[PDB]
């Protein structure tokens, strides 16, 4: 517990934030987000390919 507490006190204050950002993402984004990302990436690929 000393080891992991000292390691945590080193690098762990961040995942506090990472959590609430993550759940902000799942609340305000994921519902209205697109279902298919592959067609999106295809779209981007042909769009960039067309010079547009």
């Amino acid at each position: 517990d000393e080891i992991q507490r000292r390691v945590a006190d080193r690098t762990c204050v961040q995942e506090q934030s990472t959590r609430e950002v993550q759940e902000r993402w799942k609340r305000h984004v994921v519902p209205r987000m697109q279902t298919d990302l592959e067609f999106n990436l295809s779209h981007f690929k042909r769009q960039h390919a067309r010079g547009q």
């Binding site: 690098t11 961040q14 959590r19 993550q22 799942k26 994921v30 987000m33 279902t35 990302l37």
Partner: protein, 56 residues
């Protein structure tokens, strides 16, 4: 059990996998709701989705 070397997980340390909505879990559940609900609500939803198709 007195000496462990360095722990390593499936995801990264201190990095969370951010959610994304996939294919089946959305499509098939929408088809399931449309199924078991009614063809009246599916008709009105066909009218709102054709509203979004004409708007598009």
């Amino acid at each position: 059990a007195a000496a462990a070397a360095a722990a390593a997980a499936a995801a990264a340390a201190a990095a969370a996998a951010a959610a994304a909505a996939a294919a089946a879990a959305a499509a098939a559940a929408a088809a399931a709701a449309a199924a078991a609900a009614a063809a009246a609500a599916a008709a009105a939803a066909a009218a709102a989705a054709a509203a979004a198709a004409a708007a598009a």
